[PDB]
């Protein structure tokens, strides 16, 4: 029994309102309510823990509040915008970037970074590609910053163009953001705006207030307040809500329920003020995620189907290309956009499967008994008829269990 009440507000951690966890174990007869950190899995980075009954005293809470104020990024958002306007107006031979600090450098505070490792002659080309200048925060427990491979990212910007979107709400996709901006600015009158939402405050010194928001994705928190929140609200509400799509690449291993709750808050911002009669539209969404999360994702967004495009990364914890060659990427796209409207590059090994009106991989065989090109892995799958589905070729149909699974599994029933 959780008579859990959303009415009352969580305590505040450095990364915005904590989330409530409850443990049920040891016979499922005891409960424990506590507020943990919304966007840090292990306690090693955000060591927040408070029993719900536990109430902070005046002094102890003052300490908590000051600590939260202290853990904030060392530059205000406003300071970032001002430093940027001053930076892009220096000669090339005076644009420096400190790599040990991940900070753009104004000529006056070079001395403080003298004995650091500093990169010189930062061109505007680099400034408009921050994903290639800052090192990626690859820790799986906090950021999981795995950046798209150039080929796949260019595919995504081209797909968003051909579909006919002018605004792209980029929650957790820095590289896609920057490439959208470069395809809108250079050599094309195609207008595409992009609004990066991310917890990586390092991207604040590269985009002005209209293009970036310091944003926590697990609790729907704008670190800079209502001004930033309203930047986001206007970016959704523009053009009566038309011409907008939200692309997300959340950290692959993180809780997946609060993600859906945050995404639904965003959709709620987009649906406000829209015609009551015309309430049959949903906000077009790309949820980029490894394929084995489908069951969970479609449990929260019934209107989502999985495209067969293999999204490739420069770096990832799920696959790194071996000496034999390149291993395949488990990460796919999940959309409410009809997959028959989405055309995959035929020059990458992608063909249109007429039975399941959508594009599929070149090595993907079409299973005629669940009516879809079913081989998600790099191999050829098999169709079990008692489970009425296709399982990976290493799985077997177990007796007594009566459902498909690997040898060396736990038997049930
Ligand atoms: N709690 C959180 N709130 C907002 N953004 C977060 C977050 N946790 C991780 N992120 C961001 O989400 C991104 C996931 S890595 C995916 C990046 C994207 N595929 C690209 O290549 O451009 C990281 O950049 C990280 O900064
Ligand atoms: Zn430095
Ligand atoms: Zn097929
Ligand atoms: Zn099948
Ligand atoms: Zn079976
Ligand atoms: Zn079994």
Numbering used by the authors: 28 to 440
Copied sentences from the primary study:
ZCCHC4 is a newly identified m6A RNA methyltransferase and is highly conserved in multicellular organisms. ZCCHC4-mediated m6A4220 methylation in 28S rRNA promotes ribosome assembly and translation, which in turn impacts cell proliferation and tumor growth. Distinct from what was observed for all other m6A methyltransferases, ZCCHC4 is organized into four domains, with three flanking zinc finger domains packed around the MTase domain, forming an integrated RNA-binding platform. Through structural, biochemical, and enzymatic characterization of ZCCHC4, a recently reported rRNA m6A writer, this study reveals the molecular basis for the ZCCHC4-mediated m6A4220 modification of 28S rRNA.
The crystal structure of ZCCHC424-464, in complex with S-adenosyl-L-homocysteine (SAH), product of methyl donor S-adenosyl-L-methionine (SAM), was refined to 3.1 Å resolution. There are six ZCCHC424-464 complexes in one asymmetric unit; among these, two ZCCHC4 molecules engage swapping of the N-terminal tail (residues M26-V28) of one to pair in antiparallel with residues F48-V51 of the other, likely due to crystal packing effects. The structure of ZCCHC424-464 reveals four closely packed domains: an N-terminal GRF zinc finger domain is followed by a C2H2 zinc finger domain, an MTase domain, and a C-terminal CCHC zinc finger domain, folded into an integrated structural unit. The SAH molecule snugly fits into a fully closed pocket, lined by a loop connecting the C2H2 domain and the MTase domain (cofactor loop: residues P163-F175), the terminal ends of αG-helix and β8-strand, and the DPPF (D276-P277-P278-F279) catalytic motif. The homocysteine moiety of SAH is surrounded by the side chains of L174-F175, T200-R202, and D276, with the amino group donating a hydrogen bond to the side-chain carboxylate of D276 and the carboxylate receiving a hydrogen bond from the backbone amide of F175. On the other end, the adenosyl moiety of SAH is embraced by the side chains of I226, N243, M244, and F245 through van der Waals contacts, with the N6 atom further forming a hydrogen bond with the side-chain carbonyl group of N243. Astonishingly, structural comparison of ZCCHC4 with METTL16, as well as other RNA methyltransferases, also reveals a striking difference in the active-site conformation: the D/N-P-P-F/W catalytic motifs of METTL16, METTL3, METTL5, and CAPAM are all readily accessible for RNA contacts; in contrast, the corresponding DPPF motif in ZCCHC4 is shielded from solvent exposure by the loop connecting αK and β13 (hereafter referred to as regulatory loop), which wedges into the catalytic center for interaction with the active-site residues. Of particular note, residue D276 forms a bifurcated side-chain hydrogen bond with regulatory loop residue Y340, which potentially occludes D276 from nucleophilic attack during the methylation reaction.
